[PDB]
Amino acid sequence: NLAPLPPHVPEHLVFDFDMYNPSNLSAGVQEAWAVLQESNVPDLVWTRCNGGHWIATRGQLIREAYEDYRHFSSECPFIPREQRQFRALANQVVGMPVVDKLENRIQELACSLIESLRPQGQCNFTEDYAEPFPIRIFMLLAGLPEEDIPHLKYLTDQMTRPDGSMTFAEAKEALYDYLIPIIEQRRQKPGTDAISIVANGQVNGRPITSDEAKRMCGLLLVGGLDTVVNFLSFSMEFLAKSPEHRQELIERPERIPAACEELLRRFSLVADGRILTSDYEFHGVQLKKGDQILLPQMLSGLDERENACPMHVDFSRQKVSHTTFGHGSHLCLGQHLARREIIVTLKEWLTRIPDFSIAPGAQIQHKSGIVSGVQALPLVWDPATTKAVHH
Ligand code: HEM
Ligand SMILES: CC1(C)[C@@H]2CC[C@@]1(C)C(=O)C2
């Protein structure tokens, strides 16, 4: 599993961290990563795992590298292996103004999900709420029928969690097979939904091609799935384990957006990277062309150099700082929609199921990867203390 130490890596910089299976996984995935942020670890280290790659362990380095796109390419952001124009278009379809308009329907969606659970006194929140939410949101956002969810959720599940029935290419191809006819059909048309708007979008002074539309539509679908699913889960895990914070938000529901932000820092989950386009000396380390560098979005907000008592969750935290949504020219297009889903989920949950907790004897498991997450989250609660609220 350890790749041979390349000629240019000095030994004092070798810290073999497996981003797919960290040593302290059972303490929590963020805690497992924050081992890179111990006093004795350099700001920039080399791991021999996963082919051999760099890791920036600090907020300064992470931010700087995502700003320095000329040295640090997004051609290969995954370990192991006019953009502004495409972003402007995507932002037409998920920007704040679209999110603002949809809030109402996002809230209806959330409420019937929680309502269909509320009387149970128990659920697997990850499977029962968190999974079916962001996919349904995308259907809403994209004027797609609910009946299309089972086949569509299957394809996206194959890209990140294959059962072996489809290779990534096959699943990719089938997603496109599904999208193309809708794009071509709505291109002809003044539809106000997200596919229509992407379909009919202009790029480089010409119209977007069908191949380009299906590609952006594809990333909008898949980028807003596992991230949200897992982030919601970390958040609910925390609240389940912490009644004081649960009551804090019950007593002051206007604090919820600041909590969201604090939880985004504390339960950050994405770890992407870049590839060096040429040799480059960076913070006193010789990087070599072709080197891949992990630049863990997760780490910035957990760096004590950026937030005091980084592992402590405080909703009154004065200067919340994090790159949970990335940094630089690829900063998440879906962050606004994500925030809304987070806030809406918490408000609509808490005002319905104020008291709840982890099933007794169950131990929550985390997994670690590009998008870290939660295996399962069993909750229990007494239905007598819940309530119903309709829209
Ligand atoms: C809490 C949930 C989310 C987190 C933590 C998050 C995290 C991010 C991060 C860190 C990046 C940049 C990766 C890089 O620089 O290589 C990003 C990019 C992106 N995300 Fe988000 N994401 C979230 C939700 C969303 C949602 C809701 C959507 C779409 C609806 C979205 C779609 C995108 C797309 C299309 C990109 C690529 C932007 C570009 O390449 O220019 N993700 N995601
Ligand atoms: C890691 C991601 C899920 C996040 C959104 C899509 C994705 C593959 C990225 O490029 C950033």
Indicate if ligand 2 lies below 6 Å from the C-beta of 296.
no
Residue 249 backbone dihedrals phi, psi, to 5 degrees: -85, -25
| Ligand 1 centroid – CA 282 distance (Å) | 26
Atom of ligand 1 nearest to the CA of 324: 5
Q: In which order are the strands placed within the sheet that holds 357-358?
A: 122-124, 378-380, 357-358
User: Which mutation among 227, 235, 295, 300 tests ligand 1's pocket best, with the greatest number of atoms within 8 A of CB?
Assistant: 227
Q: Helices 256-266 and 226-241: crossing angle, nearest 10°?
A: 110
3-state secondary structure 200-226: CCEECCEECCHHHHHHHHHHHHHHCCH
Residues 78/272, Cβ–Cβ less than 8 Å: yes
Residues 227/371, Cβ–Cβ less than 8 Å: yes
- Label the pairing between strands 44-47 and 378-380: unpaired
Q: Report the DSSP beta bridge partners of residue 275.
A: 73, 292
Question: What 3-state class would DSSP assign to 381?
Answer: coil
| Ligand 1 centroid – CA 335 distance (Å) | 7
| Ligand 1 centroid – CA 17 distance (Å) | 24
Question: What 3-state class would DSSP assign to 46?
Answer: strand
Residues 276/293, Cβ–Cβ less than 8 Å: yes
Atom of ligand 2 nearest to the CA of 326: 11
The span from the CA of 180 to the CA of 242, in Å, is 46
| Ligand 1 centroid – CA 318 distance (Å) | 25
Q: Which residues of 126-162 are buried (b: 16+ CB within 10 A; e: fewer)?
A: bebbbbebbbbbbbbbbebeeeeeeebbebbbbbeee
Indicate if ligand 1 lies below 6 Å from the C-beta of 270.
yes
CATH class held by domain 1-391: mainly alpha
**How many other CB atoms are there within 10 angstroms of residue 192's CB atom?**
10
Q: Report the DSSP beta bridge partners of residue 367.
A: 373
Residue 300 amino acid letter: S
Residues 93/78, Cβ–Cβ less than 8 Å: no
Tell me the two tokens of residue 8.
């240019």
Question: What 3-state class would DSSP assign to 275?
Answer: strand
**332 annotated ligand binder:** yes
Question: What 3-state class would DSSP assign to 33?
Answer: helix
DSSP state for residue 2 in the 8-state scheme: P
Indicate if ligand 1 lies below 6 Å from the C-beta of 338.
yes
**Residue 231 buriedness (CB in 10 A; 0-12 / 13-18 / 19+):** buried
* Active site members: 161, 226-227, 332-334
Nearest Cα neighbor of 179 from 148, 157, 158 is 148
**Residue 25 buriedness (CB in 10 A; 0-12 / 13-18 / 19+):** middle
Atom of ligand 2 nearest to the CA of 272: 1
Atom of ligand 1 nearest to the CA of 337: 27
DSSP state for residue 380 in the 8-state scheme: E
Indicate if ligand 1 lies below 6 Å from the C-beta of 227.
yes
Resolution as reported, in Å:
2.6
Q: How far is CA 27 from CA 23, 24, 148, 361, 366, in A?
A: 9, 6, 39, 16, 9
3-state secondary structure 231-244: HHHHHHHHHHHCHH
Residue 145 amino acid letter: P
Contacts of residue 9, Cβ cutoff 8 Å, sequence gap at least 6: 46, 52
Closest Cα to atom 40 of ligand 1: 330
Nearest Cα neighbor of 227 from 272, 279, 283, 187 is 272
